[PDB]
From a paper:
The receptor tyrosine kinase EphA2 interacts with ephrin (Efn) ligands to mediate bi‐directional signals that drive cellular sorting processes during tissue development. The Eph extracellular domain (ECD) consists of four subdomains: the ligand‐binding domain (LBD), the cysteine‐rich domain (CRD) that includes a sushi domain and an epidermal‐growth‐factor (EGF)‐like domain (Arora et al., 2023), the N‐terminal fibronectin‐3 domain (FN1), and the C‐terminal fibronectin‐3 domain (FN2). Efn ligands bind to the LBD and sterically seed clusters of Eph ECDs, which then drive forward signaling through tyrosine autophosphorylation of the Eph intracellular domains (ICDs). To elucidate the details of the mechanisms of Eph receptor clustering and activation, we developed a panel of synthetic Abs targeting the ECD subdomains of EphA2, and produced monovalent Fabs and bivalent IgGs to either negatively or positively modulate signaling.
Residue numbers in the entry:
A (entry chain D): 1 to 9, 11 to 35, 40 to 64, 67 to 72, 74 to 238
B (entry chain C): 27 to 329
C (entry chain E): 2 to 32, 39 to 58, 66 to 72, 74 to 80, 83 to 111, 115 to 220, 223 to 232
């Protein structure tokens, strides 16, 4: 199984530096291009950089040339993107991907070319002056004033945090059906807020336990809150 | 006259071609820029060293061919256009062939092949982009002969260069059909050796003859496929004259005693105008010809 | 070179034929690739070398070239096909297309409306968030107004919407009204009013009720 894993993302001040890592397994880098493509939140895919570790060639998108350097280390089978002089416009999810390279433009290997066939999962880079702030987690209680037949709604309000992301799970991932976790909104305070809600049978309220597990890795904070009928 | 025995850049030219070692090495490239899918083979293991990479063609029936010419069309990238790799990088490749009375199938044995020549590029490709947009196409041609078996293989060995093979054209030369000296000469295979000049027999065209005491028509076929050194000729027989490379009857009022190069002659003085295609003109009524005198003589009055 | 995608986004019903077009600014290599990206996830390869179906991809996807014009085709749009689609230059600059957002059109479905008072905990911090939940509805367009003792609220609420449920193509939405502790405790009745088409549904709580 071919695999690419990003790490290094995070929150960095304008003009700062961050180095991303793309750990490859299941294949050797020497045989292919390793690419970095980025997606600013709400924006399209932008190719950014590429490297062939066999040949040592590198190329960059203009938006990036001069400030980013892609490199690779054949020993750890890993590719890196050194970013310097970061601006607010570099805030994005950074994916890495592979593709079969060709020395001749407009030609592809009949057996080995498959475009960008494997991707990583992405790492978020946020360029900002705001400090890290962990979230406040409040219950969205189902009460007897939430009595809506045989289907009740309860949830967790995840308020005033920075930077993205938080993940919410319910009962340590055991409760998955009926869960909705809303995209965060940027508030006027400069901090993010979101809610996660789940719908659940009303006859299970006084008897089944519901706990939201909010993780905020950027601040190394986890919050487990039991949501109780009030 | 070039008779082609295998053309890579053509429909199904990639056909049954083989790469050794299995896996990396030579690889079949596709270019779909034009509505036509185009193909090539390339290799660029210029960083690695210890490179011995083979691309063998399909087995090609030589048929009547004695000598085969091989026309290659390739690009070579520059060794120092590759950041720090020249230590193992090369800029030539080797052209091999093998004669074989059977198609060996997917079987390939390097040792069975014979080196024809090192193939080297006239113009090198220097590009600063990893994928080179603009190429410098090279054309080289070699020959082997004589062939002795039912067919043959071509193989290409890369020693660690950055090569692309776009076209492999292999053909043999032949002397075309020809009309010369009022004889038709048949389409003849060429020779393998430069001194080799076979003789091919001319067939007098309709109404032409080889003269009673003259050389019968021979032509000689050469290595390039051009005919050489005519020997003899046919002649338009009596009653006929040369028109272009055919023999035409004499016009009414003309005659021709015998086969010669000359045109028909006007019927001599004191004669009756001859019908079409005559050998002699009849003496005008009341005139005669001396019995010692040939029919080209004018007739005199009967005394 | 540049690569223009058309249309920017579109809506279609299940089992509709959908066609997305990518136009190359100049003459490039014809090895256009097509990708499908679910919100928040990596792109997934659909088509490579302009027409080759990538291993594993359902046969309803197909790629075609007609000169400068590259097209992706979905013969039978499935609920799971909601995503954003990108053509890509399969050559030297590897430039990506502007993308096309595809949303699944379906029958109407009324929201289930739930209202949530602030926790006694949050109130202690001096702020009150009142959450209105709109669960599993279609279309996305709904008017959600807050009332406080019958007074229509403006400018103190924010909305958030999930993406489509990849099985039934519904949405869910939230409106969060934020008040100071002082303001929240000065009023009794907190109401969330959802209008869709010709129907309004209001859910309410009384600050002096359990
Ligand atoms: Cl707990
Ligand atoms: Cl409604």
């Amino acid at each position: 199984e071919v695999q690419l894993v990003e790490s290094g993302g995070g929150l960095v001040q304008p003009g700062g530096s961050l180095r991303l890592s793309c750990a490859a397994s299941g294949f050797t880098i020497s045989s292919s291009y390793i690419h970095w493509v980025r997606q600013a939140p709400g924006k399209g895919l932008e190719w950014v950089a590429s490297i062939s570790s066999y040949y040592g060639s590198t190329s960059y998108a203009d938006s990036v040339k001069g400030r980013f350097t892609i490199s690779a280390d054949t020993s750890k089978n890993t590719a890196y993107l050194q970013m310097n002089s970061l601006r607010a416009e570099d805030t994005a999810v950074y994916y890495c991907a592979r593709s079969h390279y060709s020395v001749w433009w407009g030609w592809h290997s009949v057996s080995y070319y498959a475009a960008f066939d494997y991707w990583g999962q992405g790492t978020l880079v946020t360029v900002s002056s705001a400090s890290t702030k962990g979230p406040s987690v409040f219950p969205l209680a189902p009460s007897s004033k939430s009595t809506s037949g045989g289907t009740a709604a309860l949830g967790c309000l995840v308020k005033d945090y920075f930077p993205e992301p938080v993940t919410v799970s319910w009962n340590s991932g055991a409760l998955t059906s009926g869960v909705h976790t809303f995209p965060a909104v940027l508030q006027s305070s400069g901090l993010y807020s979101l809610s996660s809600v789940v719908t659940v049978p009303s006859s299970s309220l006084g008897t089944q336990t519901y706990i939201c597990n909010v993780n905020h890795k950027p601040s190394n904070t986890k919050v487990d809150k039991k949501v109780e009928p009030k | 006259k070039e008779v082609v025995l295998l053309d890579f850049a053509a429909a199904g030219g990639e056909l049954g071609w083989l790469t050794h070692p299995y896996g990396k090495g030579w690889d079949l490239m596709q270019n779909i820029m034009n509505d036509m899918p185009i193909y090539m083979y390339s290799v660029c293991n210029v960083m690695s060293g210890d490179q011995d990479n083979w691309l063998r063609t399909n087995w090609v029936y030589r048929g009547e061919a004695e000598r085969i010419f091989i026309e290659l069309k390739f690009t070579v990238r520059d060794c120092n256009s590759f950041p720090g790799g020249a230590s193992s990088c090369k800029e030539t490749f080797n052209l091999y062939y093998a004669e074989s009375d059977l198609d060996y199938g997917t079987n390939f044995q390097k040792r069975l092949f014979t080196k024809i020549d090192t193939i080297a590029p006239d113009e090198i490709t220097v590009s600063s982009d990893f994928e080179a947009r603009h190429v410098k196409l090279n054309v080289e041609e070699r020959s082997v002969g004589p062939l002795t078996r039912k067919g043959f293989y071509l193989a290409f060995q890369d020693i660690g260069a950055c090569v692309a093979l776009l076209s492999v054209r292999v053909y043999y030369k032949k002397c075309p059909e020809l009309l010369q000296g009022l004889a038709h000469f048949p389409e003849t295979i060429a020779g393998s050796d430069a001194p080799s000049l076979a003789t091919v027999a001319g067939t007098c065209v309709d109404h032409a003859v080889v003269p009673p005491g003259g050389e019968e028509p021979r032509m000689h076929c050469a290595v390039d496929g051009e005919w050489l050194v005519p020997i003899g000729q046919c002649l338009c027989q009596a009653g006929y004259e040369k028109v272009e490379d055919a023999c035409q009857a004499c016009s009414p009022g003309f005659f021709k005693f015998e086969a010669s190069e000359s045109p028909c002659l006007e019927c001599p003085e004191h004669t009756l105008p001859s019908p079409e295609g005559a050998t002699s003109c009849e003496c005008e009524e009341g005139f005669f010809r001396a019995p010692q005198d040939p029919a080209s003589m004018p007739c005199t009055l009967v005394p | 070179i540049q690569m223009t995608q058309s249309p920017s986004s579109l809506s279609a019903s299940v089992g509709d034929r959908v066609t997305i077009t990518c136009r190359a600014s100049q003459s490039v290599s014809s090895a256009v690739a097509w990708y499908q990206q679910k919100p928040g996830k990596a792109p997934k390869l659909l088509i490579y070398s302009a027409s080759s179906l990538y291993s594993g991809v359902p046969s309803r996807f197909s790629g075609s070239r007609s000169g400068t014009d590259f097209t992706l085709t979905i013969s039978s749009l499935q609920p799971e096909d909601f995503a954003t689609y990108y053509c890509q230059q399969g050559s030297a600059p590897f430039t990506f297309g502007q993308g096309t957002k595809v949303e699944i059109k379906r029958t109407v479905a009324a929201p289930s409306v739930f209202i949530f008072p602030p926790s006694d905990e949050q109130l202690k911090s001096g702020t009150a968030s009142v959450v209105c939940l709109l669960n599993n509805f279609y279309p996305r367009e709904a008017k959600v107004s807050w009332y406080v003792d019958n007074a229509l609220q403006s400018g103190n609420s924010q909305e958030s919407v999930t993406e489509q449920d990849s099985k039934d193509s519904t949405y869910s939405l939230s409106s969060t009204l934020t008040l100071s502790k002082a303001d929240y405790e000065k009023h009794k009745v907190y109401a969330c009013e959802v209008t869709q088409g010709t129907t309004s549904v209001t859910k309410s709580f009384n600050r002096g009720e359990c």
